[PDB]
């Protein structure tokens, strides 16, 4: 099993015990740990903070201790969004500028290879994807001629039937990259006017909740447009997000005014870190979509979905279920990463359990 996880550069900034640096990561806990985001500046792959050398270097420095962990570094994200992505992707000259760029950056700063995170192509860009994907992993193909090992490329994908059908020719990109990662916890959000799970793994009976928005659901979709499940990642959070409650209900369907109230530490609305949610249960009313299988809690006017042990382990053991190729977690500095706030004085609660259900069996 693959286990994929990904490090946030901004994570360093979070007050107090947030802040989380790269030495934070338990050499042995993932596979892959993925670096979020590069820039892409003169068409070329770019560092984004002031310290992504320093950084990529203390990143780079846990396969002392684990010598067969593989880094990626992630070209896009959401701060980068669609446009810029497009522009480069449309046209010849600036593809080929961007892709020349890779290997070198990536061989400086001591990466395996690289992971595209364009959010998201439009219908006017599935072709320029396809192009870029093929032609970026046969720059890889060409430089692993040198004699080191050929870098990785891999892909985010979001778990929406709309926005994969939109975006992505995925029987084409699925024979290009070594793994896909599939977003499979953006299915609800405070545009939606009422509660709701962003990761459910399966439907809610209860509510008419739209067929598609569940992992299963997605896992199902990519498979049968020809993404081999030796190639397929399934995303799990160990964020939750938040909302904030417009009556006394608390229940499918209960009406929402806005996102929950920002956390301590990582200071946005409409989102927790896990360790932030060990801290919010404490006088919390816990619940779990029977169904779905995922919980959520509620205090005073908030109402958090998300994930924990056991439902990690649970979309660990579906995964596995279904022969795919592994699990991602979005994000290792939004896990207890500390191990201090969840009563367990374990460090990396959820991205444990699912390591420890994909080494069983
Ligand atoms: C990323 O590149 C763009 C385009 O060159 C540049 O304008 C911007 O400052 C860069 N962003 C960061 C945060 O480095």
């Given at each position: 099993?693959?286990?994929?996880?990904?490090?946030?550069?901004?994570?360093?900034?979070?007050?107090?015990?947030?802040?989380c640096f790269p030495d934070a990561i338990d050499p042995f806990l993932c596979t892959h740990v993925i670096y979020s985001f590069a820039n892409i500046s003169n068409n070329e792959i770019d560092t984004w903070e002031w310290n992504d050398v320093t950084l990529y270097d203390t990143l780079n420095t846990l396969k002392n201790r684990?010598?067969?962990?593989?880094?990626?570094?992630?070209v896009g994200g959401w701060?980068?969004?669609?446009?810029?992505?497009?522009?480069?992707?449309?046209?010849?000259?600036?593809?080929?500028?961007?892709?020349?760029?890779?290997?070198?950056?990536?061989?400086?700063?001591?990466?395996?290879?690289?992971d595209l995170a364009w959010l998201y192509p439009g219908w006017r860009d599935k072709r320029h994807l396809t192009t870029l994907v093929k032609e970026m992993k046969a720059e890889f193909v060409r430089e692993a001629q040198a004699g080191t090992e050929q870098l990785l490329l891999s892909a985010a994908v979001p778990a929406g039937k709309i926005a994969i059908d939109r975006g992505y020719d995925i029987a084409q990109i699925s024979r290009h990259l070594d793994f896909?990662?599939?977003?499979?916890?953006?299915?609800?959000?405070?545009?939606?006017?009422?509660?709701?799970?962003?990761?459910?793994?399966?439907?809610?009976?209860?509510?008419?909740?739209?067929?598609?928005?569940?992992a299963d659901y997605a896992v199902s979709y990519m498979l049968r447009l020809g993404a081999p499940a030796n190639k397929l990642v399934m995303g799990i959070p160990t964020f939750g997000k938040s909302y904030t409650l417009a009556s006394s209900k608390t229940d499918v369907g209960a009406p929402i005014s806005g996102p929950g109230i920002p956390g301590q530490?990582?200071?946005?609305?409409?989102?927790?870190?896990?360790?932030?949610?060990?801290?919010?249960?404490?006088?919390?009313?816990?619940?779990?979509?029977?169904?779905?299988?995922?919980?959520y809690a509620t205090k005073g006017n908030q109402w958090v979905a998300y994930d924990d042990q056991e439902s990690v382990k649970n979309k660990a053991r579906y995964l596995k279920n279904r022969q795919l190729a592994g699990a991602m977690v979005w994000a290792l500095d939004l896990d207890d990463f500390r191990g201090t706030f969840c009563g367990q004085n374990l460090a990396f609660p959820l991205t444990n359990a699912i390591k420890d259900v994909l080494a069983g069996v």
């Amino acid at each position: 099993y693959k286990l994929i996880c990904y490090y946030t550069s901004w994570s360093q900034y979070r007050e107090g015990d947030g802040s989380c640096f790269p030495d934070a990561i338990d050499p042995f806990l993932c596979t892959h740990v993925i670096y979020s985001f590069a820039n892409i500046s003169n068409n070329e792959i770019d560092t984004w903070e002031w310290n992504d050398v320093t950084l990529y270097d203390t990143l780079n420095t846990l396969k002392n201790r684990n010598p067969k962990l593989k880094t990626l570094l992630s070209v896009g994200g959401w701060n980068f969004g669609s446009q810029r992505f497009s522009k480069i992707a449309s046209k010849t000259q600036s593809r080929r500028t961007f892709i020349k760029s890779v290997p070198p950056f990536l061989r400086t700063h001591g990466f395996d290879g690289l992971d595209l995170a364009w959010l998201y192509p439009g219908w006017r860009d599935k072709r320029h994807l396809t192009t870029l994907v093929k032609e970026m992993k046969a720059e890889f193909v060409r430089e692993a001629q040198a004699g080191t090992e050929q870098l990785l490329l891999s892909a985010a994908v979001p778990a929406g039937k709309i926005a994969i059908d939109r975006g992505y020719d995925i029987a084409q990109i699925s024979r290009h990259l070594d793994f896909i990662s599939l977003l499979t916890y953006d299915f609800h959000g405070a545009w939606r006017q009422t509660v709701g799970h962003h990761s459910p793994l399966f439907r809610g009976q209860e509510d008419a909740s739209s067929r598609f928005s569940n992992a299963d659901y997605a896992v199902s979709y990519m498979l049968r447009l020809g993404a081999p499940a030796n190639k397929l990642v399934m995303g799990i959070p160990t964020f939750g997000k938040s909302y904030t409650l417009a009556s006394s209900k608390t229940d499918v369907g209960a009406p929402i005014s806005g996102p929950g109230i920002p956390g301590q530490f990582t200071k946005e609305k409409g989102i927790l870190a896990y360790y932030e949610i060990c801290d919010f249960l404490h006088g919390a009313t816990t619940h779990r979509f029977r169904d779905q299988q995922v919980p959520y809690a509620t205090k005073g006017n908030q109402w958090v979905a998300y994930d924990d042990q056991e439902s990690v382990k649970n979309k660990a053991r579906y995964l596995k279920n279904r022969q795919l190729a592994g699990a991602m977690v979005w994000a290792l500095d939004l896990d207890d990463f500390r191990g201090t706030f969840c009563g367990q004085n374990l460090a990396f609660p959820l991205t444990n359990a699912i390591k420890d259900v994909l080494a069983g069996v």
